Amino acid sequence: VFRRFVEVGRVAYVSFGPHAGKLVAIVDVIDQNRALVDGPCTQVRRQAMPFKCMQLTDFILKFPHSAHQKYVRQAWQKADINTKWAATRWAKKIEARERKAKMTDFDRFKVMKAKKMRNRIIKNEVKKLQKAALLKASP
Amino acid sequence: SGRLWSKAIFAGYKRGLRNQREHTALLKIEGVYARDETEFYLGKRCAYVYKAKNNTVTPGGKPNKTRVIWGKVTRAHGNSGMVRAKFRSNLPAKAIGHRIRVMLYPSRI
Amino acid sequence: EVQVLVLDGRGHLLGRLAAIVAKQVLLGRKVVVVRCEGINISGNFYRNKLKYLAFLRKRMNTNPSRGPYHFRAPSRIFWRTVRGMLPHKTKRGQAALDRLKVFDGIPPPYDKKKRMVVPAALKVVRLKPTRKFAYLGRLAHEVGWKYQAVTATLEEKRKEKAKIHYRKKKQLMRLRKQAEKNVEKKIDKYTEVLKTHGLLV
Amino acid sequence: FLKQLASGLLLVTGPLVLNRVPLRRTHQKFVIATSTKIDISNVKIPKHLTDAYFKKKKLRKPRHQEGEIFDTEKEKYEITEQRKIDQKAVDSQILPKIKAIPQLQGYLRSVFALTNGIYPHKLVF
Amino acid sequence: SHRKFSAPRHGSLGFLPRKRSSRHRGKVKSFPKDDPSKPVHLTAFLGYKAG
Amino acid sequence: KTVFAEHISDECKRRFYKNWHKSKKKAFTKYCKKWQDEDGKKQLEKDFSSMKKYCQVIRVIAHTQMRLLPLRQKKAHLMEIQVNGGTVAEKLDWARERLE
RNA sequence: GGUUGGCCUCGGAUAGCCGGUCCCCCGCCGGGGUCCGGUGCGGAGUGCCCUUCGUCCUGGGAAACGGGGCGCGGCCGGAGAGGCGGCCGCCCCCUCGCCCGUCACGCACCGCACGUUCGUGGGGAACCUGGCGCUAAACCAUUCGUAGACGACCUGCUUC
RNA sequence: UGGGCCACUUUUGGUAAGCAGAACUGGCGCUGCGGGAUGAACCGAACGCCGGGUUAAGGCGCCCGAUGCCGACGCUCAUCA
RNA sequence: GCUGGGAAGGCCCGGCGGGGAAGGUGGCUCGGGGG
Ligand SMILES: [Mg+2]
Ligand SMILES: [Mg+2]
Ligand SMILES: [Mg+2]
Ligand SMILES: [Mg+2]
Ligand SMILES: [Mg+2]
Ligand SMILES: [Mg+2]
Ligand SMILES: [Mg+2]
Ligand SMILES: [Mg+2]
Ligand SMILES: [Mg+2]
Ligand SMILES: [Mg+2]
Ligand SMILES: [Mg+2]
């Protein structure tokens, strides 16, 4: 049933803490609660990190456990984790939350107007589709 | 044309377990549930608006039955978004669990 | 808040839901808890039944008609738990207790409404999966509650109507997506405004 | 917002044709500064738009001392023709810049309000 | 101290309170449990104690 | 829902009065008129249909016949007698036949 | 005296879920099995809907199979506390109300609070204005004695 | 005033005692206040009438002010926890 | 500012190298699989 596993090379997303919002790679595993973690291309120097603040992604890098940061960086750049991550629906949901939170008052006004017109056209087409679906006559 | 004030609840007075300092009140601002979020509301004017039997003069309007006790937020209380407030007269104990308006008036944004 | 807060009691721990509810009604909020027979109590069923039987034993020796009243319905059991967390002997506590309404099952005013959930009181997150728990409905039935069967049948009939309503809701949502594909040339102007500002990825 | 006056009060005109606010004074403590701005450089605020210009003028009971005949005359404040001139002078060069950016005039026509889900501490203005 | 000799209790507590009945007719309070298999019938009747 | 029959006898109607001597004997006089008009008949049919659809147990209100007894009392005794043994539709048809 | 937009509902699982779709079975809709998507839930309650300055010239789009009647009449659903919803037929109105623009105007009350809603709020007496409708009991007193300290209770009192 | 009593520690008689008798310091008596739910003595701290700030001892699910921290690591299932 | 005049660490494929291994890479062998 499980599809994502804590393992060497597994890329995780830090959900809270001093490094929230960043990607990291799992370089080693310690004592069932923490992991030696390292983001060399995401500005997270090598350090311990609890599993409670990690959320595993779908990417796995290939490097031996406790390899130096150089080889972790080479695997990260060769796999292009930064670009592949930004193209996922997970990252796009994160970005949408960020640009919605920083929405200004004028932007809220323009969203109110655009959504007002968008909903009226759509629900008009919904009523039009409902009548077409209701036009059934066959025993 | 719109609400223009935040909804708050008069939770109670500043108190120990067995002593009550009625001169200051604890308010629960809606949507504010962490101490770090209360910085916006510090110093904001707050109003306990109630109704009575006799008409009283209304600034810029005809006399009606609306009365108000004015106050302001002084500091944050606890870790969960409580705030303390000082009103010009101590809030009546019948207002516990009722609406206090936080007015946005002395804004710093 | 100002509106009525309707909560679904299924899957909620008795005392953790009661503590949240008691604080809410003291803050001037109207709270309705429905389906109190779905409430769980941590610990195996036998030791929870023993706790209630010990409660049944507490009665006034001189006149039991004056003594503690042992309410058998799960809604009244939960109501008494909330009352244990309220200052019910003062006017403030009595006003708070009047703002709470509890039901077994979901009666007609609230069976057509959306029901909230308190995660800080849910059994799935508050309780280790290997521990045992008791159902308030089964506990109540075995200490005197007489309406477990009729509430079961009425809950099944309610769930059949809810399934019908949900299928119409899915049908309307499918038609919503079909319409959104149809009016696309004249919607992308407002869609890009939404996408720019983080609504509608 | 146009300029700060010598008394520290702000001089504002959300143009009268948009939201019925004339050239008026307001206190910075009682306004919210949003992040949307229009470049109002190279506009000319008339020199006589000072605090003395905007100060309220009234006159009651110069020769009247005992109140038995009502002094309820003159009570209606009247807009000076000069105030109408200055309103048109400023609006004639503020409006063409408001129309420059899309649906800003509609934004200035509407009023601000708090909806039951939105909270000022979370809003970015 | 305990009573010197055991003796059963006088009367039954299951018939309390010993008040005048609030009714004169006498109400059923429990009809026979209904089963659909049987034919349709009446479960009660009213009579008068002749002697 | 309770449905009463047309033509309720006097001895039954005495049960509804603390002073039958002084009363105008108006009990059920407007109710019995809905057994004859068309709108009241439709309403009675709806009440029986609703009893068929939503009721689980039905009872009949039956009264004794005081006038056949040697007693001073003329006021009849009313009681609900449960109808057992069948579906709700069957016991409603059985009870409807037994009205009056 | 409170209050100062609404949310009109799957069941649920949590070592798993949600959505969609072709074949088989159950009287033209549901249940399965493939298959395709999504899952730090985006068909998202961290959500969604509504969104209030008002009007006047005046264009473009959206619509135009549309919108509003405390307007009538009929039907349907809902019983667990239905106290609530829904669908038609007829009649009368406006082509307005929704988005982007043109155009100017409204007390612009001269910096200031209790403003802004639910709301035609709840309750109680009284007055006027129209229509459709109704003409009863309870208690005492008397009587009974299936009852009873007294209250209370069971009963009778111009028809066959 | 010349009846004292209590607590840490030392200590005698007694099986022991909320018993009886000593030493030392402190307390209660004469003393309110915060905490120990409650309480002469315990813990904190001693007091004119107040405003603001901060603490002690003690706490921060709800009663009931304060953890509504995305607190850390383990241990523990009790049919008298 | 101090400290071990910080400890680690980053980049320089660190280069001439040496040694050690294992939570053993490649390869090799065996046992289970996908065309
Ligand atoms: Mg014995
Ligand atoms: Mg002693
Ligand atoms: Mg003394
Ligand atoms: Mg002293
Ligand atoms: Mg003291
Ligand atoms: Mg104390
Ligand atoms: Mg204790
Ligand atoms: Mg102080
Ligand atoms: Mg405590
Ligand atoms: Mg608290
Ligand atoms: Mg033990």
Short mmCIF file of N, CA and C in Angstrom, two decimals, chain C residues 42-105:
data_model
loop_
_atom_site.label_atom_id
_atom_site.label_comp_id
_atom_site.label_asym_id
_atom_site.label_seq_id
_atom_site.Cartn_x
_atom_site.Cartn_y
_atom_site.Cartn_z
N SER C 42 -12.17 6.02 25.11
CA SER C 42 -10.97 5.21 25.11
C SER C 42 -11.03 4.16 26.21
N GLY C 43 -10.32 3.06 26.00
CA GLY C 43 -10.39 1.92 26.89
C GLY C 43 -11.43 0.92 26.43
N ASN C 44 -11.21 -0.34 26.78
CA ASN C 44 -12.07 -1.40 26.29
C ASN C 44 -13.50 -1.22 26.80
N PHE C 45 -14.43 -1.91 26.15
CA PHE C 45 -15.84 -1.70 26.45
C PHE C 45 -16.18 -2.12 27.87
N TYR C 46 -15.57 -3.20 28.36
CA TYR C 46 -15.93 -3.71 29.68
C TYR C 46 -15.58 -2.72 30.77
N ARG C 47 -14.40 -2.11 30.71
CA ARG C 47 -14.01 -1.21 31.78
C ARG C 47 -14.75 0.12 31.70
N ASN C 48 -15.27 0.46 30.53
CA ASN C 48 -16.12 1.64 30.44
C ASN C 48 -17.52 1.35 30.94
N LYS C 49 -18.01 0.13 30.69
CA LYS C 49 -19.30 -0.27 31.24
C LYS C 49 -19.24 -0.34 32.75
N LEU C 50 -18.12 -0.81 33.30
CA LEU C 50 -17.95 -0.83 34.75
C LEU C 50 -17.99 0.58 35.32
N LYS C 51 -17.42 1.54 34.60
CA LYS C 51 -17.45 2.92 35.06
C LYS C 51 -18.88 3.44 35.14
N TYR C 52 -19.70 3.11 34.15
CA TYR C 52 -21.08 3.56 34.21
C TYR C 52 -21.87 2.81 35.27
N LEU C 53 -21.59 1.52 35.47
CA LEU C 53 -22.31 0.78 36.49
C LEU C 53 -21.98 1.30 37.88
N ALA C 54 -20.74 1.72 38.10
CA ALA C 54 -20.39 2.39 39.35
C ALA C 54 -21.13 3.71 39.49
N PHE C 55 -21.33 4.42 38.38
CA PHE C 55 -22.16 5.61 38.40
C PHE C 55 -23.60 5.28 38.75
N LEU C 56 -24.10 4.14 38.26
CA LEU C 56 -25.46 3.71 38.58
C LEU C 56 -25.60 3.40 40.06
N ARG C 57 -24.52 2.95 40.70
CA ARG C 57 -24.61 2.59 42.11
C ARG C 57 -24.71 3.81 43.00
N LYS C 58 -24.17 4.95 42.56
CA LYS C 58 -24.28 6.17 43.35
C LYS C 58 -25.71 6.66 43.35
N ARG C 59 -26.40 6.51 44.47
CA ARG C 59 -27.76 7.01 44.59
C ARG C 59 -27.99 7.37 46.05
N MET C 60 -28.94 8.26 46.28
CA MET C 60 -29.24 8.67 47.64
C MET C 60 -29.86 7.51 48.40
N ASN C 61 -29.22 7.12 49.50
CA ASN C 61 -29.71 5.98 50.27
C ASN C 61 -31.08 6.27 50.86
N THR C 62 -31.30 7.50 51.32
CA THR C 62 -32.57 7.88 51.92
C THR C 62 -33.68 7.97 50.88
N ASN C 63 -33.45 8.63 49.76
CA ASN C 63 -34.48 8.80 48.73
C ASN C 63 -33.81 8.85 47.37
N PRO C 64 -33.77 7.73 46.66
CA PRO C 64 -33.13 7.72 45.34
C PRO C 64 -33.81 8.61 44.32
N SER C 65 -35.07 8.96 44.53
CA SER C 65 -35.75 9.87 43.62
C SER C 65 -35.18 11.28 43.71
N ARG C 66 -34.50 11.60 44.80
CA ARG C 66 -33.79 12.87 44.90
C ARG C 66 -32.37 12.76 44.38
N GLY C 67 -31.79 11.57 44.40
CA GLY C 67 -30.37 11.38 44.22
C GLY C 67 -29.91 11.66 42.82
N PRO C 68 -28.68 11.24 42.51
CA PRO C 68 -28.15 11.48 41.16
C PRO C 68 -29.04 10.83 40.12
N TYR C 69 -29.29 11.56 39.05
CA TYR C 69 -30.10 11.07 37.95
C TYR C 69 -29.18 10.51 36.89
N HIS C 70 -29.39 9.26 36.54
CA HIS C 70 -28.54 8.55 35.60
C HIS C 70 -29.27 8.52 34.27
N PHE C 71 -28.84 9.36 33.35
CA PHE C 71 -29.47 9.46 32.05
C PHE C 71 -28.83 8.45 31.11
N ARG C 72 -29.67 7.67 30.44
CA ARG C 72 -29.21 6.51 29.70
C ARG C 72 -28.97 6.79 28.22
N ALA C 73 -29.66 7.75 27.63
CA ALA C 73 -29.45 8.05 26.23
C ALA C 73 -28.05 8.60 26.01
N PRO C 74 -27.39 8.25 24.90
CA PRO C 74 -26.03 8.77 24.67
C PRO C 74 -25.97 10.28 24.59
N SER C 75 -27.02 10.91 24.06
CA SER C 75 -27.06 12.36 24.00
C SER C 75 -27.09 12.95 25.40
N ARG C 76 -27.87 12.37 26.29
CA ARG C 76 -27.93 12.86 27.65
C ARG C 76 -26.67 12.51 28.43
N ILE C 77 -26.01 11.41 28.08
CA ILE C 77 -24.72 11.09 28.69
C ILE C 77 -23.69 12.14 28.31
N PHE C 78 -23.63 12.49 27.03
CA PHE C 78 -22.69 13.52 26.60
C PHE C 78 -23.05 14.86 27.20
N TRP C 79 -24.34 15.16 27.29
CA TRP C 79 -24.78 16.41 27.89
C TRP C 79 -24.33 16.52 29.34
N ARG C 80 -24.40 15.42 30.08
CA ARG C 80 -23.94 15.43 31.46
C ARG C 80 -22.43 15.56 31.55
N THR C 81 -21.70 15.05 30.55
CA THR C 81 -20.26 15.23 30.53
C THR C 81 -19.89 16.69 30.31
N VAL C 82 -20.60 17.37 29.42
CA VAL C 82 -20.38 18.80 29.22
C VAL C 82 -20.74 19.57 30.47
N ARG C 83 -21.82 19.17 31.14
CA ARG C 83 -22.23 19.84 32.37
C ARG C 83 -21.18 19.70 33.46
N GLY C 84 -20.40 18.61 33.43
CA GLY C 84 -19.32 18.47 34.37
C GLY C 84 -18.16 19.40 34.11
N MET C 85 -18.10 19.98 32.92
CA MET C 85 -17.08 20.95 32.58
C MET C 85 -17.61 22.38 32.58
N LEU C 86 -18.82 22.58 32.91
CA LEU C 86 -19.36 23.93 33.01
C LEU C 86 -19.62 24.29 34.46
N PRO C 87 -19.59 25.58 34.80
CA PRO C 87 -20.04 26.01 36.13
C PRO C 87 -21.55 26.10 36.20
N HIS C 88 -22.21 24.94 36.16
CA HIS C 88 -23.64 24.88 35.92
C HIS C 88 -24.47 25.39 37.09
N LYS C 89 -23.87 25.66 38.24
CA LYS C 89 -24.63 26.16 39.37
C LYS C 89 -24.65 27.68 39.45
N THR C 90 -24.09 28.36 38.46
CA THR C 90 -24.19 29.81 38.34
C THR C 90 -25.06 30.15 37.14
N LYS C 91 -25.45 31.42 37.06
CA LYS C 91 -26.28 31.86 35.95
C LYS C 91 -25.51 31.83 34.64
N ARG C 92 -24.21 32.13 34.68
CA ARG C 92 -23.40 32.06 33.47
C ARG C 92 -23.29 30.64 32.96
N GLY C 93 -23.08 29.68 33.86
CA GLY C 93 -22.98 28.30 33.45
C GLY C 93 -24.28 27.74 32.93
N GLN C 94 -25.40 28.18 33.50
CA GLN C 94 -26.70 27.71 33.03
C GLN C 94 -27.03 28.28 31.66
N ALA C 95 -26.66 29.53 31.42
CA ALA C 95 -26.85 30.11 30.10
C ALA C 95 -26.02 29.38 29.05
N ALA C 96 -24.79 29.02 29.41
CA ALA C 96 -23.95 28.26 28.49
C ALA C 96 -24.53 26.88 28.23
N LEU C 97 -25.07 26.25 29.27
CA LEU C 97 -25.65 24.92 29.12
C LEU C 97 -26.90 24.95 28.26
N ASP C 98 -27.60 26.08 28.23
CA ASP C 98 -28.79 26.20 27.39
C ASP C 98 -28.43 26.39 25.93
N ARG C 99 -27.20 26.76 25.64
CA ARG C 99 -26.76 26.96 24.26
C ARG C 99 -26.34 25.70 23.61
N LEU C 100 -26.40 24.59 24.33
CA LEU C 100 -26.00 23.29 23.81
C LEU C 100 -27.22 22.42 23.61
N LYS C 101 -27.31 21.80 22.43
CA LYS C 101 -28.37 20.85 22.12
C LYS C 101 -27.74 19.57 21.62
N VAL C 102 -28.18 18.44 22.15
CA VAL C 102 -27.58 17.15 21.87
C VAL C 102 -28.66 16.20 21.38
N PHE C 103 -28.32 15.36 20.41
CA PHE C 103 -29.28 14.45 19.82
C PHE C 103 -28.63 13.09 19.58
N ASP C 104 -29.46 12.05 19.66
CA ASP C 104 -29.10 10.73 19.16
C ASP C 104 -29.54 10.65 17.71
N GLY C 105 -28.63 10.32 16.82
CA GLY C 105 -28.97 10.39 15.42
C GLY C 105 -28.98 11.84 14.97
#
